[PDB]
Design a protein around this ligand. Sequence first.
Ligand code: 3D9
Ligand code: NA
Lengths: 296, 286
Amino acid sequence: DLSSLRDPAGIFELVEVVGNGGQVYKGRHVKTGQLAAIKVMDVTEDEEEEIKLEINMLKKYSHHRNIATYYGAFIKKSPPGHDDQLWLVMEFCGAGSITDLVKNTKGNTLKEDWIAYISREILRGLAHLHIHHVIHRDIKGQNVLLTENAEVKLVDFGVSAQLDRTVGRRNTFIGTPYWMAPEVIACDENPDATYDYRSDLWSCGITAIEMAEGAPPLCDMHPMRALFLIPRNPPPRLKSKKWSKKFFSFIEGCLVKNYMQRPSTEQLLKHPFIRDQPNERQVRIQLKDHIDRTRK
Amino acid sequence: DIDLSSLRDPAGIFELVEVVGNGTYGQVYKGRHVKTGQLAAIKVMDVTEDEEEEIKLEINMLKKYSHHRNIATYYGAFIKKSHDDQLWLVMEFCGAGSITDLVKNTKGNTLKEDWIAYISREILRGLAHLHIHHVIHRDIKGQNVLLTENAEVKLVDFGVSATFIGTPYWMAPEVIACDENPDATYDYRSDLWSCGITAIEMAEGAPPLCDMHPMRALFLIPRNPPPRLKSKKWSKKFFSFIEGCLVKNYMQRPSTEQLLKHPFIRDQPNERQVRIQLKDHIDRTR
Ligand SMILES: c1ccc(-c2cc3c(Nc4ccncc4)ncnn3c2)cc1
Ligand code: NA
Protein backbone atom coordinates (compact mmCIF):
# COMPACT_ATOMS: atom_id res chain seq x y z
CA ASP A 1 0.00 0.00 0.00
CA LEU A 2 1.33 3.40 -1.11
CA SER A 3 -1.62 5.45 0.17
CA SER A 4 -1.60 4.30 3.80
CA LEU A 5 0.22 4.91 7.08
CA ARG A 6 0.55 1.44 8.61
CA ASP A 7 2.87 -0.02 11.26
CA PRO A 8 5.81 -1.85 9.62
CA ALA A 9 5.21 -4.88 11.88
CA GLY A 10 5.12 -8.17 10.00
CA ILE A 11 5.84 -6.56 6.63
CA PHE A 12 9.28 -4.95 7.15
CA GLU A 13 12.03 -4.97 9.78
CA LEU A 14 15.44 -3.34 10.28
CA VAL A 15 18.70 -5.30 10.40
CA GLU A 16 21.63 -2.81 10.38
CA VAL A 17 22.61 0.83 9.73
CA VAL A 18 24.35 1.95 6.52
CA GLY A 19 25.11 5.60 7.32
CA ASN A 20 24.03 8.50 9.53
CA GLY A 21 23.53 10.94 6.65
CA GLY A 22 18.61 10.96 7.22
CA GLN A 23 19.40 7.57 8.73
CA VAL A 24 19.45 4.67 6.29
CA TYR A 25 19.08 0.99 7.20
CA LYS A 26 19.62 -2.31 5.45
CA GLY A 27 16.24 -3.95 5.92
CA ARG A 28 14.19 -6.91 4.76
CA HIS A 29 10.67 -7.98 3.85
CA VAL A 30 9.34 -10.21 6.64
CA LYS A 31 7.12 -12.41 4.46
CA THR A 32 9.72 -12.96 1.71
CA GLY A 33 13.20 -12.11 3.02
CA GLN A 34 13.83 -9.70 0.14
CA LEU A 35 16.39 -7.01 1.02
CA ALA A 36 15.23 -3.38 1.08
CA ALA A 37 16.71 0.01 1.98
CA ILE A 38 14.81 1.82 4.74
CA LYS A 39 15.05 5.51 5.61
CA VAL A 40 14.14 6.21 9.23
CA MET A 41 13.28 9.63 10.55
CA ASP A 42 11.68 10.96 13.72
CA VAL A 43 8.39 12.77 13.22
CA THR A 44 6.13 14.73 15.54
CA GLU A 45 2.36 14.22 15.63
CA ASP A 46 2.01 17.58 13.90
CA GLU A 47 4.13 16.36 10.98
CA GLU A 48 2.22 13.08 10.69
CA GLU A 49 -0.84 15.10 9.72
CA GLU A 50 1.33 16.92 7.20
CA ILE A 51 2.33 13.63 5.58
CA LYS A 52 -1.31 12.58 5.41
CA LEU A 53 -1.93 15.64 3.28
CA GLU A 54 1.05 14.76 1.09
CA ILE A 55 -0.17 11.21 0.60
CA ASN A 56 -3.24 12.78 -1.01
CA MET A 57 -0.97 14.71 -3.37
CA LEU A 58 0.91 11.56 -4.44
CA LYS A 59 0.93 10.42 -8.05
CA LYS A 60 1.06 6.74 -9.02
CA TYR A 61 3.60 5.14 -11.31
CA SER A 62 4.57 1.53 -12.01
CA HIS A 63 7.89 -0.23 -11.38
CA HIS A 64 10.67 0.58 -13.83
CA ARG A 65 14.12 -0.95 -14.12
CA ASN A 66 15.96 2.39 -13.87
CA ILE A 67 14.19 3.32 -10.66
CA ALA A 68 14.95 1.74 -7.28
CA THR A 69 11.39 0.76 -6.45
CA TYR A 70 9.61 2.77 -3.75
CA TYR A 71 7.71 0.31 -1.55
CA GLY A 72 5.84 2.79 0.62
CA ALA A 73 5.70 4.73 3.87
CA PHE A 74 5.22 3.28 7.34
CA ILE A 75 4.97 4.70 10.85
CA LYS A 76 6.26 2.84 13.93
CA LYS A 77 4.54 4.51 16.90
CA SER A 78 6.14 5.32 20.26
CA PRO A 79 4.52 5.86 23.72
CA PRO A 80 2.11 8.86 23.97
CA GLY A 81 3.97 12.18 24.00
CA HIS A 82 7.17 10.89 22.37
CA ASP A 83 8.12 11.37 18.70
CA ASP A 84 7.23 8.43 16.44
CA GLN A 85 9.15 7.14 13.42
CA LEU A 86 8.67 7.37 9.65
CA TRP A 87 9.91 4.54 7.45
CA LEU A 88 10.47 4.94 3.72
CA VAL A 89 11.23 1.65 2.00
CA MET A 90 13.01 1.13 -1.32
CA GLU A 91 14.66 -1.57 -3.47
CA PHE A 92 18.19 -2.56 -2.42
CA CYS A 93 21.24 -1.85 -4.59
CA GLY A 94 24.54 -3.27 -3.35
CA ALA A 95 27.17 -1.84 -5.72
CA GLY A 96 26.81 1.64 -4.26
CA SER A 97 26.42 4.99 -5.99
CA ILE A 98 27.85 6.64 -9.11
CA THR A 99 29.86 8.97 -6.86
CA ASP A 100 31.45 5.94 -5.21
CA LEU A 101 32.10 4.61 -8.71
CA VAL A 102 33.99 7.73 -9.80
CA LYS A 103 35.92 7.94 -6.50
CA ASN A 104 36.82 4.23 -6.69
CA THR A 105 38.42 4.84 -10.09
CA LYS A 106 41.91 6.04 -10.97
CA GLY A 107 42.03 9.76 -11.74
CA ASN A 108 38.45 10.20 -10.52
CA THR A 109 37.01 10.07 -14.02
CA LEU A 110 34.98 7.56 -16.00
CA LYS A 111 35.42 6.53 -19.62
CA GLU A 112 33.21 8.52 -21.97
CA ASP A 113 31.16 5.49 -23.07
CA TRP A 114 30.54 4.64 -19.43
CA ILE A 115 29.19 8.19 -19.03
CA ALA A 116 26.98 7.72 -22.09
CA TYR A 117 25.57 4.42 -20.77
CA ILE A 118 24.94 5.68 -17.24
CA SER A 119 23.44 8.99 -18.45
CA ARG A 120 20.98 7.14 -20.70
CA GLU A 121 19.80 4.96 -17.80
CA ILE A 122 19.21 8.10 -15.72
CA LEU A 123 17.27 9.64 -18.60
CA ARG A 124 15.08 6.53 -19.01
CA GLY A 125 14.28 6.53 -15.31
CA LEU A 126 13.41 10.23 -15.56
CA ALA A 127 11.31 9.74 -18.69
CA HIS A 128 9.18 7.31 -16.71
CA LEU A 129 8.83 9.78 -13.83
CA HIS A 130 8.03 12.72 -16.09
CA ILE A 131 5.48 10.90 -18.23
CA HIS A 132 3.64 10.17 -14.98
CA HIS A 133 3.87 13.87 -14.02
CA VAL A 134 6.53 13.52 -11.32
CA ILE A 135 9.71 15.57 -10.89
CA HIS A 136 12.62 13.74 -9.20
CA ARG A 137 14.11 16.96 -7.78
CA ASP A 138 17.44 15.50 -6.59
CA ILE A 139 19.45 14.01 -9.45
CA LYS A 140 23.13 13.58 -8.62
CA GLY A 141 25.85 10.92 -8.50
CA GLN A 142 25.01 10.07 -4.88
CA ASN A 143 21.36 9.43 -5.80
CA VAL A 144 22.12 7.12 -8.72
CA LEU A 145 22.71 3.51 -7.67
CA LEU A 146 24.40 0.47 -9.17
CA THR A 147 23.16 -3.03 -8.38
CA GLU A 148 25.38 -6.11 -8.21
CA ASN A 149 24.51 -6.59 -11.91
CA ALA A 150 25.62 -3.21 -13.27
CA GLU A 151 21.98 -2.08 -13.29
CA VAL A 152 21.63 1.67 -12.87
CA LYS A 153 18.72 2.84 -10.72
CA LEU A 154 17.51 6.21 -9.44
CA VAL A 155 16.88 6.56 -5.70
CA ASP A 156 13.15 6.77 -4.90
CA PHE A 157 12.00 7.28 -1.32
CA GLY A 158 8.70 8.68 -2.54
CA VAL A 159 9.81 11.46 -4.89
CA SER A 160 6.20 12.21 -5.85
CA ALA A 161 5.38 13.84 -2.53
CA GLN A 162 9.00 14.38 -1.48
CA LEU A 163 8.31 12.81 1.93
CA ASP A 164 12.02 12.52 2.74
CA ARG A 165 12.55 16.26 2.24
CA THR A 166 9.37 17.57 3.85
CA VAL A 167 9.53 16.64 7.56
CA GLY A 168 12.05 15.89 10.31
CA ARG A 169 13.85 19.21 10.91
CA ARG A 170 15.97 18.65 7.80
CA ASN A 171 13.26 20.18 5.65
CA THR A 172 14.39 23.63 6.79
CA PHE A 173 17.82 23.08 5.31
CA ILE A 174 18.70 24.51 1.94
CA GLY A 175 21.04 21.60 1.21
CA THR A 176 23.76 21.18 -1.42
CA PRO A 177 23.52 23.66 -4.35
CA TYR A 178 25.87 22.12 -6.96
CA TRP A 179 23.27 20.09 -8.89
CA MET A 180 20.53 22.74 -8.74
CA ALA A 181 19.17 24.27 -11.90
CA PRO A 182 19.16 28.09 -12.07
CA GLU A 183 15.36 28.21 -11.79
CA VAL A 184 15.15 26.46 -8.40
CA ILE A 185 17.37 29.14 -6.85
CA ALA A 186 15.76 32.33 -5.64
CA CYS A 187 17.74 35.38 -6.65
CA ASP A 188 17.22 38.94 -7.83
CA GLU A 189 15.85 37.86 -11.22
CA ASN A 190 13.86 34.83 -10.01
CA PRO A 191 12.06 35.60 -6.71
CA ASP A 192 9.95 32.45 -6.84
CA ALA A 193 11.99 29.30 -7.32
CA THR A 194 9.94 27.33 -9.84
CA TYR A 195 10.52 23.55 -10.11
CA ASP A 196 9.93 21.94 -13.52
CA TYR A 197 10.48 18.46 -14.96
CA ARG A 198 13.29 20.05 -16.97
CA SER A 199 15.13 20.88 -13.72
CA ASP A 200 16.09 17.19 -13.62
CA LEU A 201 17.77 17.50 -17.04
CA TRP A 202 20.04 20.28 -15.79
CA SER A 203 20.99 18.11 -12.83
CA CYS A 204 21.49 15.22 -15.23
CA GLY A 205 24.01 17.34 -17.16
CA ILE A 206 25.76 18.27 -13.91
CA THR A 207 25.90 14.58 -13.02
CA ALA A 208 27.65 13.97 -16.38
CA ILE A 209 30.30 16.54 -15.50
CA GLU A 210 30.55 14.79 -12.13
CA MET A 211 31.22 11.42 -13.79
CA ALA A 212 33.78 13.03 -16.07
CA GLU A 213 35.67 14.99 -13.42
CA GLY A 214 34.77 13.48 -10.03
CA ALA A 215 33.02 16.62 -8.84
CA PRO A 216 30.26 18.99 -10.02
CA PRO A 217 31.28 22.44 -11.29
CA LEU A 218 32.04 25.02 -8.57
CA CYS A 219 32.91 22.32 -5.99
CA ASP A 220 35.85 24.50 -4.92
CA MET A 221 33.37 27.22 -3.96
CA HIS A 222 31.72 27.80 -0.59
CA PRO A 223 28.15 26.51 -1.14
CA MET A 224 26.54 29.95 -0.52
CA ARG A 225 28.87 31.45 -3.10
CA ALA A 226 28.01 28.67 -5.59
CA LEU A 227 24.29 29.23 -5.01
CA PHE A 228 24.84 32.87 -5.91
CA LEU A 229 26.94 32.03 -9.01
CA ILE A 230 24.73 29.30 -10.57
CA PRO A 231 21.94 31.58 -11.85
CA ARG A 232 24.55 34.15 -12.90
CA ASN A 233 27.36 32.23 -14.57
CA PRO A 234 27.06 31.13 -18.18
CA PRO A 235 26.37 27.38 -18.46
CA PRO A 236 29.20 25.30 -16.96
CA ARG A 237 31.62 23.30 -19.18
CA LEU A 238 33.99 20.33 -19.01
CA LYS A 239 37.50 21.53 -18.14
CA SER A 240 39.38 19.21 -20.49
CA LYS A 241 39.33 19.36 -24.29
CA LYS A 242 39.97 15.61 -24.52
CA TRP A 243 36.25 14.79 -24.74
CA SER A 244 34.39 13.99 -27.96
CA LYS A 245 32.28 16.52 -29.83
CA LYS A 246 29.19 14.44 -29.00
CA PHE A 247 29.89 14.65 -25.27
CA PHE A 248 30.30 18.46 -25.21
CA SER A 249 27.09 18.81 -27.23
CA PHE A 250 25.19 16.63 -24.79
CA ILE A 251 26.44 18.69 -21.81
CA GLU A 252 25.46 21.88 -23.64
CA GLY A 253 22.14 20.14 -24.39
CA CYS A 254 21.42 19.64 -20.68
CA LEU A 255 22.77 22.90 -19.31
CA VAL A 256 20.52 25.44 -21.02
CA LYS A 257 20.21 28.25 -18.42
CA ASN A 258 16.60 29.21 -19.19
CA TYR A 259 14.49 26.12 -18.49
CA MET A 260 11.83 27.27 -20.97
CA GLN A 261 14.43 26.63 -23.71
CA ARG A 262 15.85 23.39 -22.30
CA PRO A 263 14.88 20.16 -24.15
CA SER A 264 12.63 17.47 -22.68
CA THR A 265 13.75 14.01 -21.58
CA GLU A 266 12.46 12.53 -24.85
CA GLN A 267 14.58 14.88 -26.96
CA LEU A 268 17.72 14.18 -24.93
CA LEU A 269 17.19 10.42 -25.22
CA LYS A 270 17.62 10.94 -28.98
CA HIS A 271 20.88 12.89 -28.62
CA PRO A 272 23.65 11.09 -30.61
CA PHE A 273 25.78 10.75 -27.45
CA ILE A 274 22.92 8.96 -25.67
CA ARG A 275 21.32 7.33 -28.70
CA ASP A 276 24.39 5.85 -30.45
CA GLN A 277 26.19 3.47 -28.09
CA PRO A 278 28.00 0.82 -30.21
CA ASN A 279 30.08 -0.53 -27.28
CA GLU A 280 27.10 -0.81 -24.91
CA ARG A 281 27.42 -4.56 -24.30
CA GLN A 282 31.14 -4.35 -23.58
CA VAL A 283 30.54 -1.37 -21.27
CA ARG A 284 27.90 -3.30 -19.29
CA ILE A 285 30.58 -5.99 -18.95
CA GLN A 286 33.33 -3.52 -18.00
CA LEU A 287 31.12 -2.20 -15.18
CA LYS A 288 30.36 -5.70 -13.94
CA ASP A 289 34.11 -6.34 -13.58
CA HIS A 290 34.70 -3.07 -11.75
CA ILE A 291 31.98 -3.89 -9.25
CA ASP A 292 33.45 -7.34 -8.63
CA ARG A 293 37.11 -6.43 -8.11
CA THR A 294 35.97 -3.66 -5.73
CA ARG A 295 34.19 -6.26 -3.59
CA LYS A 296 37.37 -8.27 -2.96
CA ASP B 1 47.52 21.88 16.38
CA ILE B 2 46.05 18.38 16.42
CA ASP B 3 47.13 15.64 14.01
CA LEU B 4 44.58 12.96 13.09
CA SER B 5 47.23 10.22 13.15
CA SER B 6 48.09 10.46 16.86
CA LEU B 7 44.47 10.06 17.96
CA ARG B 8 43.62 6.91 19.91
CA ASP B 9 40.80 4.42 19.56
CA PRO B 10 38.02 5.31 22.05
CA ALA B 11 37.59 1.71 23.31
CA GLY B 12 37.53 1.48 27.10
CA ILE B 13 37.59 5.28 27.30
CA PHE B 14 34.28 6.45 25.80
CA GLU B 15 31.20 4.47 24.81
CA LEU B 16 28.17 5.70 22.85
CA VAL B 17 24.73 5.42 24.46
CA GLU B 18 22.13 6.80 22.05
CA VAL B 19 21.77 9.34 19.26
CA VAL B 20 20.69 12.57 20.92
CA GLY B 21 20.79 14.98 17.98
CA ASN B 22 22.63 16.19 14.86
CA GLY B 23 25.52 18.50 13.99
CA THR B 24 26.36 20.52 10.88
CA TYR B 25 28.54 17.57 9.92
CA GLY B 26 28.19 14.47 12.08
CA GLN B 27 25.75 12.68 14.36
CA VAL B 28 25.73 13.66 18.05
CA TYR B 29 25.54 10.97 20.74
CA LYS B 30 24.88 10.97 24.43
CA GLY B 31 28.19 9.32 25.28
CA ARG B 32 29.69 7.99 28.48
CA HIS B 33 33.15 8.07 30.05
CA VAL B 34 33.65 4.34 30.72
CA LYS B 35 35.82 4.55 33.85
CA THR B 36 33.71 7.12 35.73
CA GLY B 37 30.27 6.83 34.11
CA GLN B 38 30.29 10.61 33.63
CA LEU B 39 28.36 11.85 30.59
CA ALA B 40 29.82 13.48 27.49
CA ALA B 41 28.36 14.44 24.13
CA ILE B 42 30.18 12.72 21.31
CA LYS B 43 30.15 13.96 17.73
CA VAL B 44 30.66 11.01 15.38
CA MET B 45 31.97 12.17 12.00
CA ASP B 46 33.03 9.89 9.14
CA VAL B 47 36.51 10.86 7.98
CA THR B 48 36.33 11.13 4.19
CA GLU B 49 39.06 12.64 2.00
CA ASP B 50 36.87 15.61 1.09
CA GLU B 51 35.72 16.49 4.62
CA GLU B 52 39.09 15.59 6.19
CA GLU B 53 40.25 19.19 6.70
CA GLU B 54 36.82 20.42 7.79
CA ILE B 55 36.97 17.92 10.65
CA LYS B 56 40.56 18.90 11.60
CA LEU B 57 39.44 22.51 12.01
CA GLU B 58 36.44 21.77 14.23
CA ILE B 59 38.80 19.99 16.63
CA ASN B 60 41.25 22.91 16.77
CA MET B 61 38.69 25.64 17.40
CA LEU B 62 36.71 23.61 19.92
CA LYS B 63 39.98 22.73 21.66
CA LYS B 64 41.34 26.29 21.88
CA TYR B 65 38.21 28.42 22.34
CA SER B 66 35.93 26.31 24.57
CA HIS B 67 37.50 27.46 27.85
CA HIS B 68 34.61 29.66 28.95
CA ARG B 69 31.48 28.79 30.96
CA ASN B 70 29.22 29.70 28.00
CA ILE B 71 31.06 27.42 25.56
CA ALA B 72 30.51 23.68 25.90
CA THR B 73 33.92 22.36 26.92
CA TYR B 74 36.17 20.23 24.70
CA TYR B 75 37.19 16.90 26.28
CA GLY B 76 39.22 15.08 23.64
CA ALA B 77 39.23 13.53 20.19
CA PHE B 78 39.39 9.89 19.09
CA ILE B 79 39.38 7.81 15.90
CA LYS B 80 37.66 4.43 15.61
CA LYS B 81 39.28 2.77 12.56
CA SER B 82 37.23 0.73 10.09
CA HIS B 83 38.35 1.94 5.34
CA ASP B 84 36.01 4.81 6.26
CA ASP B 85 37.26 5.85 9.71
CA GLN B 86 35.07 7.48 12.36
CA LEU B 87 36.25 10.45 14.41
CA TRP B 88 34.86 10.99 17.90
CA LEU B 89 34.72 14.59 19.07
CA VAL B 90 34.10 14.51 22.81
CA MET B 91 32.77 17.41 24.83
CA GLU B 92 30.72 18.53 27.83
CA PHE B 93 27.25 16.99 27.85
CA CYS B 94 24.43 19.49 28.15
CA GLY B 95 21.58 17.36 29.51
CA ALA B 96 18.59 19.71 29.19
CA GLY B 97 18.78 19.87 25.38
CA SER B 98 18.45 22.96 23.21
CA ILE B 99 16.69 26.30 23.47
CA THR B 100 14.51 25.33 20.49
CA ASP B 101 13.58 22.21 22.49
CA LEU B 102 12.79 24.29 25.57
CA VAL B 103 10.38 26.66 23.83
CA LYS B 104 8.58 23.84 22.00
CA ASN B 105 8.04 22.06 25.34
CA THR B 106 6.75 25.17 27.07
CA LYS B 107 3.05 25.99 27.14
CA GLY B 108 2.05 28.23 24.25
CA ASN B 109 5.58 28.00 22.84
CA THR B 110 6.85 31.17 24.50
CA LEU B 111 9.25 31.95 27.33
CA LYS B 112 8.88 34.54 30.10
CA GLU B 113 10.66 37.75 29.15
CA ASP B 114 13.13 37.31 32.03
CA TRP B 115 14.02 33.79 30.90
CA ILE B 116 14.82 35.40 27.54
CA ALA B 117 16.98 38.14 29.11
CA TYR B 118 19.03 35.63 31.06
CA ILE B 119 19.45 33.23 28.17
CA SER B 120 20.34 35.98 25.68
CA ARG B 121 22.96 37.41 28.04
CA GLU B 122 24.61 34.00 28.45
CA ILE B 123 24.65 33.70 24.65
CA LEU B 124 26.23 37.17 24.39
CA ARG B 125 28.94 36.38 26.98
CA GLY B 126 29.96 33.24 25.12
CA LEU B 127 29.93 35.27 21.89
CA ALA B 128 32.06 38.03 23.39
CA HIS B 129 34.63 35.40 24.37
CA LEU B 130 34.78 34.15 20.79
CA HIS B 131 34.90 37.62 19.23
CA ILE B 132 37.73 38.81 21.47
CA HIS B 133 39.61 35.74 20.19
CA HIS B 134 38.74 36.75 16.60
CA VAL B 135 36.28 33.87 16.12
CA ILE B 136 32.85 34.25 14.53
CA HIS B 137 30.46 31.46 15.48
CA ARG B 138 28.46 31.84 12.24
CA ASP B 139 25.66 29.46 13.19
CA ILE B 140 23.92 30.89 16.24
CA LYS B 141 20.37 29.60 16.49
CA GLY B 142 18.19 27.97 19.14
CA GLN B 143 19.37 24.51 18.10
CA ASN B 144 23.00 25.37 18.92
CA VAL B 145 22.27 26.97 22.29
CA LEU B 146 22.08 24.29 24.96
CA LEU B 147 21.13 23.96 28.61
CA THR B 148 22.76 21.79 31.26
CA GLU B 149 20.69 20.05 33.94
CA ASN B 150 21.55 23.04 36.15
CA ALA B 151 20.07 25.63 33.76
CA GLU B 152 23.52 26.74 32.58
CA VAL B 153 23.71 28.05 29.01
CA LYS B 154 26.30 26.76 26.50
CA LEU B 155 27.21 27.44 22.86
CA VAL B 156 27.99 24.50 20.58
CA ASP B 157 29.07 23.73 17.01
CA PHE B 158 32.12 25.30 15.41
CA GLY B 159 31.23 23.43 12.20
CA VAL B 160 30.63 26.44 9.94
CA SER B 161 32.96 28.73 11.95
CA ALA B 162 35.71 27.53 9.58
CA THR B 163 29.23 21.56 0.98
CA PHE B 164 25.73 21.73 2.50
CA ILE B 165 23.86 24.92 3.29
CA GLY B 166 22.03 24.67 6.60
CA THR B 167 18.92 26.46 7.83
CA PRO B 168 18.72 30.12 6.67
CA TYR B 169 16.28 31.60 9.21
CA TRP B 170 18.94 32.89 11.63
CA MET B 171 21.29 34.30 8.95
CA ALA B 172 22.17 38.00 8.87
CA PRO B 173 21.38 39.86 5.60
CA GLU B 174 25.08 40.40 4.94
CA VAL B 175 26.04 36.68 4.80
CA ILE B 176 23.65 36.14 1.91
CA ALA B 177 25.22 36.93 -1.46
CA CYS B 178 23.33 39.06 -3.95
CA ASP B 179 24.01 41.62 -6.70
CA GLU B 180 25.04 44.58 -4.53
CA ASN B 181 26.65 42.16 -2.07
CA PRO B 182 28.38 39.65 -4.38
CA ASP B 183 31.02 38.49 -1.88
CA ALA B 184 28.80 38.25 1.22
CA THR B 185 31.15 40.38 3.30
CA TYR B 186 30.44 40.10 7.05
CA ASP B 187 32.05 40.44 10.49
CA TYR B 188 31.50 39.38 14.14
CA ARG B 189 28.24 41.33 14.18
CA SER B 190 26.63 38.61 12.05
CA ASP B 191 26.26 36.63 15.26
CA LEU B 192 24.43 39.47 17.00
CA TRP B 193 21.72 39.41 14.33
CA SER B 194 21.41 35.66 14.87
CA CYS B 195 21.15 36.26 18.62
CA GLY B 196 18.23 38.65 17.93
CA ILE B 197 16.46 35.98 15.87
CA THR B 198 17.14 33.44 18.64
CA ALA B 199 15.49 35.84 21.10
CA ILE B 200 12.47 36.11 18.76
CA GLU B 201 12.48 32.31 18.60
CA MET B 202 12.33 32.20 22.43
CA ALA B 203 9.46 34.72 22.37
CA GLU B 204 7.30 33.24 19.60
CA GLY B 205 8.43 29.60 19.28
CA ALA B 206 9.81 30.01 15.77
CA PRO B 207 12.08 32.43 13.89
CA PRO B 208 10.62 35.05 11.54
CA LEU B 209 9.86 33.76 8.01
CA CYS B 210 9.27 30.28 9.51
CA ASP B 211 6.18 29.83 7.34
CA MET B 212 8.29 30.35 4.20
CA HIS B 213 10.20 27.85 2.14
CA PRO B 214 13.87 28.07 3.27
CA MET B 215 14.96 29.11 -0.24
CA ARG B 216 12.30 31.83 -0.20
CA ALA B 217 13.56 32.97 3.23
CA LEU B 218 17.08 33.28 1.79
CA PHE B 219 15.76 35.64 -0.88
CA LEU B 220 13.63 37.68 1.54
CA ILE B 221 16.03 38.29 4.46
CA PRO B 222 18.28 40.78 2.64
CA ARG B 223 15.24 42.59 1.19
CA ASN B 224 12.96 42.71 4.22
CA PRO B 225 13.00 45.31 7.02
CA PRO B 226 14.30 44.17 10.45
CA PRO B 227 11.94 41.52 11.87
CA ARG B 228 9.70 42.64 14.76
CA LEU B 229 7.97 40.73 17.55
CA LYS B 230 4.26 40.10 16.77
CA SER B 231 2.84 40.91 20.21
CA LYS B 232 2.56 44.29 21.92
CA LYS B 233 2.81 42.71 25.39
CA TRP B 234 6.65 42.74 25.67
CA SER B 235 8.51 45.52 27.49
CA LYS B 236 10.03 48.61 25.86
CA LYS B 237 13.43 47.19 26.82
CA PHE B 238 12.91 43.89 24.97
CA PHE B 239 11.72 45.64 21.76
CA SER B 240 14.82 47.81 21.91
CA PHE B 241 17.13 44.86 22.43
CA ILE B 242 15.60 43.09 19.40
CA GLU B 243 15.94 46.32 17.41
CA GLY B 244 19.62 46.45 18.38
CA CYS B 245 20.45 42.87 17.35
CA LEU B 246 18.58 43.36 14.12
CA VAL B 247 19.97 46.57 12.65
CA LYS B 248 19.70 45.79 8.88
CA ASN B 249 23.01 47.34 7.88
CA TYR B 250 25.70 45.61 9.96
CA MET B 251 27.87 48.74 9.67
CA GLN B 252 25.81 50.42 12.39
CA ARG B 253 24.79 47.34 14.37
CA PRO B 254 26.12 47.54 17.95
CA SER B 255 29.12 45.46 19.04
CA THR B 256 28.85 42.49 21.41
CA GLU B 257 30.14 44.72 24.22
CA GLN B 258 27.50 47.38 23.48
CA LEU B 259 24.66 44.83 23.56
CA LEU B 260 25.88 43.45 26.88
CA LYS B 261 25.35 47.00 28.23
CA HIS B 262 21.80 47.07 26.89
CA PRO B 263 19.44 47.52 29.87
CA PHE B 264 17.49 44.45 28.78
CA ILE B 265 20.71 42.43 29.11
CA ARG B 266 22.40 44.47 31.86
CA ASP B 267 19.57 45.00 34.40
CA GLN B 268 18.43 41.54 35.57
CA PRO B 269 17.11 41.70 39.18
CA ASN B 270 15.26 38.36 39.10
CA GLU B 271 18.29 36.47 37.78
CA ARG B 272 18.53 34.24 40.87
CA GLN B 273 14.83 33.32 40.64
CA VAL B 274 15.04 32.73 36.88
CA ARG B 275 17.75 30.07 37.25
CA ILE B 276 15.47 28.30 39.73
CA GLN B 277 12.39 28.55 37.49
CA LEU B 278 14.49 27.22 34.60
CA LYS B 279 15.91 24.37 36.71
CA ASP B 280 12.37 23.39 37.73
CA HIS B 281 11.09 23.51 34.16
CA ILE B 282 13.90 21.17 33.08
CA ASP B 283 13.03 18.69 35.83
CA ARG B 284 9.31 18.67 35.07
CA THR B 285 10.07 17.77 31.44
CA ARG B 286 12.38 14.89 32.33
C1 3D9 C 1 18.49 16.25 24.27
C2 3D9 C 1 18.88 16.53 22.97
C3 3D9 C 1 20.18 16.93 22.69
C4 3D9 C 1 21.09 17.04 23.74
C5 3D9 C 1 22.48 17.49 23.50
C6 3D9 C 1 23.08 17.83 22.28
C7 3D9 C 1 24.36 18.21 22.57
C8 3D9 C 1 25.46 18.66 21.79
N1 3D9 C 1 25.30 18.78 20.41
C9 3D9 C 1 26.24 19.26 19.48
C10 3D9 C 1 27.62 19.34 19.73
C11 3D9 C 1 28.47 19.82 18.76
N2 3D9 C 1 28.00 20.20 17.58
C12 3D9 C 1 26.71 20.13 17.29
C13 3D9 C 1 25.80 19.67 18.22
N3 3D9 C 1 26.59 18.97 22.42
C14 3D9 C 1 26.74 18.88 23.74
N4 3D9 C 1 25.78 18.46 24.50
N5 3D9 C 1 24.54 18.12 23.94
C15 3D9 C 1 23.40 17.68 24.49
C16 3D9 C 1 20.68 16.76 25.06
C17 3D9 C 1 19.38 16.35 25.31
NA1 NA D 1 33.69 25.96 29.09
